[PDB]
Design a protein around this nucleic acid. Structure first.
Ligand SMILES: [K+]
Ligand SMILES: [K+]
Ligand SMILES: [Mg+2]
Ligand SMILES: [Mg+2]
Ligand SMILES: [Mg+2]
Ligand SMILES: [Mg+2]
Ligand SMILES: [Mg+2]
Ligand SMILES: [Mg+2]
Ligand SMILES: [Mg+2]
Ligand SMILES: [Mg+2]
Ligand SMILES: [Mg+2]
Ligand SMILES: [Mg+2]
Ligand SMILES: [Mg+2]
Ligand SMILES: [Mg+2]
Ligand SMILES: [Mg+2]
Ligand SMILES: [Mg+2]
Ligand SMILES: [Mg+2]
Ligand SMILES: [Mg+2]
Ligand SMILES: [Mg+2]
Ligand SMILES: [Mg+2]
Ligand SMILES: [Mg+2]
Ligand SMILES: [Mg+2]
Ligand SMILES: [Mg+2]
Ligand SMILES: [Mg+2]
Lengths: 203, 193, 51, 99, 148
RNA sequence: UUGACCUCAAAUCAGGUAGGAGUACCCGCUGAACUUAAGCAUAUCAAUAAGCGGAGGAAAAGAAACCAACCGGGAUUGCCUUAGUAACGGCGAGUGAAGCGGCAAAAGCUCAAAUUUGAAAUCUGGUACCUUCGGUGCCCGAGUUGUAAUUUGGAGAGGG
RNA sequence: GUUCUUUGUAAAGUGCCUUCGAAGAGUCGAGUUGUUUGGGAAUGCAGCUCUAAGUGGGUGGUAAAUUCCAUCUAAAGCUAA
């Protein structure tokens, strides 16, 4: 098929053809609204890899997010505390711009469920993502058992709870010694390690 | 607050520790609930021993490699050597573990043997037959206990060849310590200008 | 010649040239769609032809 | 690779009868795959070189492979990636005009 | 229980056994190990020498199972043999049919030579042995077999 | 001149969905200071309180880009241990996991990347009827910028 | 248990020979900054810059080069107790 050529070509982002396409598309996205419906995936191969299907109930949204650090919103830079917390300008927003993108997209299309998202473009000011959403009310999704899992209420706003790919990456949900702090959940692990377990017959 | 001669204590109670204190008042209630759940699960499933057959497995970490214990599931190689497919074993109550590998012939043979024993000691009910009640036994683990293999005999003949086991250990340790130095010395001696 | 995401068919001229397949860049994915009873087709190929 | 039967030394451990388990299809995740080789060659044909790859080629021709490897290590993550990239760039140079 | 504590006996005594001049204040000397170098230095140097500072080299990700090596001295060397069979092996101290003692199966990694054993052959299987332990086992007509 | 396509609109168009509440527990963001250090700035309190977003009956995690270094274990979770230990720390005050081992419960899996190409075999909707959590026939439409079947690495696929 | 629906020359499993075996990119990874962690020449996370490969890649708790080895297969997803 052609999806493999798409995948290989998309990795040559500094080639002449992809640079030209990047410039033209970034200009067009900057001309359109910050959040807007995309008629079709810009990268159909990436959409398929992330679970998109060309059927009714699958929706693509393009979203613009401001790049850079998270400036502390304190007035006049005053933090009213110890000097270790006086920092304002080098604070990093411990969540991805991709996660912010799909949260804003889900807020706009609250009737849908964020399935995934992928990077499509960026400039100095903005990072551009396309968000794959699924319509849980469409009968083509309620049937087709491969996708009706997302119709369950437990998957409401999974992007707002960090259950998408970028959300789990930012939550540090991975196996092994490098993720001891966040394997079953950071706060859950902290509660477990800071809970005093007392039995009826004290040990 | 450093008083007279007492050991240095490290009681980590400087957080809001009283907000997280789990007193297991429900120990007995949870035991009763677990026994109830086991009873209802046994009644719900057909006559079936409440758990899957588990393989025999060598523990890692030489602190524990001297002992054998129940593993997760039989390897695909063990299932094939016992004459089953993995899906069929999973449907007739054999735990299958695609991750584990067989590098030990003793363990592999033991697992194939206990698989064959399990097959010869279970009765698989036909899908569309009669299959009269077969007096469900609750524990496959109790029916097929894990046995620690015997390694030697009770009594034997002394075969001292004057090897000085302590010296053997010292020499092995020294050879390991100096293998790299002697290897690089032989490399620099094989220069041959 | 009007595949809106152009990456889908940019390699096609070079793939055809490498495989020795005669290829023509033609105006209209809508025209190819009317060829194949679709709205658009973005490609159209003849593998076997009548005598 | 056989164990020595003692708890110390080079090949320490218990002597056990080996089996050589059947090779998993994993451990071949980066396999040869003629399909991927062809697709990657065609993509390298249709898309040219990145600016840093062109600079690496010019560095190989003008300042030598050591300088090119240093610049490739700066551009890419690690020294092994720099070595592989410089090897691929000099293969490209060989397949270029100086065939 | 509370009825046996001295606080029942301090009822009616104003200072509750804590003194009139020096009272029971909150933390007169600081909390926890405060001032171990400044005003509790005497009580730290006495009863706790070596407390401050560093003494060796670090070991990241140390696993105690690597160093698991329980030691069994020669002085017992026989509780690993069942009690009934112990008499039967102490009698007939023959180099043939010598009792085999798997110390690793008994849960030990190194055999040390503290005590002395009766002059009867024993086949001792061990991961490690001390030089004197092996010397005494051999002098008793036994042998040490290295296992892993 | 007509008929398409692409993109973008409008309708009190046909059918739906989101908001808000609760919030003990759960998933994240944001985020202190009192306090301890007998002062205090790193540290501590605390990755806590407060603030914000988001679910359920549980949530999350979950079938290894794991642990290990062994005669190797084999998803996740929880308990007993590891262990007040390795380690971190004005190495001060303090902080502080993880492997193994016993147990509770156990469950496994599926998409992308494949030419159906001798037959888009797939699906929403409308309509009529029916045995109405749906089915059948018909008709628009979606869809080849790829919807079905076939495969998910433990494999597996094409041929004999 | 009971009885009509009997699906279907349909679907699934099994051995041998042969050819293959596609496996996720502004992602891994790296530098730097901030935060965080017991993680200490840097535990995770995030911002910016650089930006891969396919006998490759990640990990193997002291930074680096060289030679091996071991163990998994990321950048996509569901799942009860
Ligand atoms: K503050
Ligand atoms: K006093
Ligand atoms: Mg559409
Ligand atoms: Mg900002
Ligand atoms: Mg008095
Ligand atoms: Mg008084
Ligand atoms: Mg309406
Ligand atoms: Mg709400
Ligand atoms: Mg307080
Ligand atoms: Mg103070
Ligand atoms: Mg004070
Ligand atoms: Mg003060
Ligand atoms: Mg709160
Ligand atoms: Mg509810
Ligand atoms: Mg429950
Ligand atoms: Mg869940
Ligand atoms: Mg897997
Ligand atoms: Mg596990
Ligand atoms: Mg202890
Ligand atoms: Mg802390
Ligand atoms: Mg099949
Ligand atoms: Mg993958
Ligand atoms: Mg923060
Ligand atoms: Mg999940």
């Amino acid at each position: 098929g052609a999806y493999k050529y798409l995948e290989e070509l998309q990795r040559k982002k500094q080639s002449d053809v992809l640079r030209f396409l990047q410039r033209v598309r970034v200009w067009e996205y900057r001309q359109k609204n910050v959040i807007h419906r995309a008629a079709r995936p810009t990268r159909p191969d990436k959409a398929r890899r992330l679970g998109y299907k060309a059927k009714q109930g699958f929706v693509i949204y393009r979203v613009r997010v401001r790049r850079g650090n998270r400036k502390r919103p304190v007035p006049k830079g005053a933090t009213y505390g110890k000097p270790t917390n006086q920092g304002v300008n080098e604070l990093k927003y411990q969540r991805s711009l991709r996660a912010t993108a799909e949260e804003r997209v889900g807020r706009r299309a609250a009737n849908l469920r964020v399935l995934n998202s992928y990077w499509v473009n960026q400039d100095s000011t903005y990072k551009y993502f396309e968000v794959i959403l699924v319509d849980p009310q469409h009968k083509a999704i309620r049937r087709d058992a491969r996708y009706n899992w997302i119709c369950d209420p437990v998957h409401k706003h999974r992007e707002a709870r960090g259950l998408t790919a970028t959300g789990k990456k930012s939550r540090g949900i991975n196996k092994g010694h490098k993720f001891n702090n966040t394997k079953a959940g950071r706060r859950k692990t902290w509660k477990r390690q800071n809970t005093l377990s007392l039995w009826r017959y004290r040990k | 607050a450093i008083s007279k001669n007492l050991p240095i204590l490290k009681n980590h109670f400087r957080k809001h520790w009283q907000e997280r204190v789990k007193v297991h008042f429900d120990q007995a209630g949870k035991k009763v609930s677990r026994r109830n759940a086991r009873a209802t699960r046994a009644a719900k499933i057909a006559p079936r021993p409440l758990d899957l057959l588990r393989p025999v497995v060598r523990a890692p970490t030489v602190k524990y490699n001297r002992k054998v214990r129940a593993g997760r599931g039989f390897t695909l190689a063990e299932v094939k050597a016992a004459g089953l497919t993995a899906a069929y074993a999973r449907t007739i109550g054999i735990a299958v573990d695609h991750r584990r590998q067989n590098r030990n012939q003793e363990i592999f043979d033991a697992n194939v043997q206990r698989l064959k024993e399990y097959q010869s000691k279970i009765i698989v009910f036909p899908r569309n037959g009669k299959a009269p009640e077969a007096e469900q036994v609750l524990s496959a683990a109790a029916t097929f206990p894990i046995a620690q293999p015997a390694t030697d005999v009770e009594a034997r003949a002394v075969q001292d060849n004057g090897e000085s086991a302590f010296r053997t250990l010292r020499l092995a340790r020294s050879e390991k310590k100096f293998r790299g130095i002697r290897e690089k010395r032989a490399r620099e001696k094989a220069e041959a200008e | 010649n009007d595949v809106d995401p152009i990456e889908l068919v940019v390699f096609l001229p070079a793939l055809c040239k490498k495989m020795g397949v005669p290829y023509a860049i033609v105006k209209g994915k809508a025209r190819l769609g009317t060829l194949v009873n679709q709205k658009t087709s973005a490609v159209a190929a003849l593998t076997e032809v009548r005598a | 690779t056989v164990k020595t039967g003692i708890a110390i030394g080079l090949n320490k451990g218990k002597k056990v009868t080996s089996m050589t388990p059947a090779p998993k299809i994993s451990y071949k995740k980066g396999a040869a795959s003629n399909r991927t080789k062809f697709v990657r060659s065609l993509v390298r044909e249709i898309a040219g070189l990145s600016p840093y790859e062109r600079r690496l080629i010019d560095l190989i021709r003008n300042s030598g492979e050591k300088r090119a490897r240093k610049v490739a290590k700066k551009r890419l993550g690690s020294f092994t990636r720099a070595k592989a990239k410089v090897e691929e760039m000099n293969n490209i140079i060989a397949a270029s005009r100086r065939h | 229980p509370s009825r046996f504590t001295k606080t029942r006996k301090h009822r009616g005594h104003v200072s509750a056994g804590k003194g009139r001049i020096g009272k029971h204040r909150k933390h007169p000397g600081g909390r926890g190990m405060a001032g171990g170098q400044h005003h509790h230095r005497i009580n730290m140097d006495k009863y706790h020498p070596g407390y401050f500072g560093k003494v060796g080299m670090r070991y990241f990700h140390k696993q105690q199972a690597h160093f698991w090596k329980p030691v069994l001295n020669l002085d017992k060397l026989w509780t690993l043999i069942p009690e009934d069979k112990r008499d039967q092996y102490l009698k007939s101290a023959s180099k043939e049919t010598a009792p085999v003692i798997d110390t690793l199966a008994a849960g030990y990694g190194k055999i040390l030579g503290k005590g002395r054993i009766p002059n009867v052959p024993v086949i001792v299987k061990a991961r490690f042995v001390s030089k004197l332990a092996e010397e005494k086992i051999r002098a008793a007509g036994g042998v040490v077999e290295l296992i892993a």
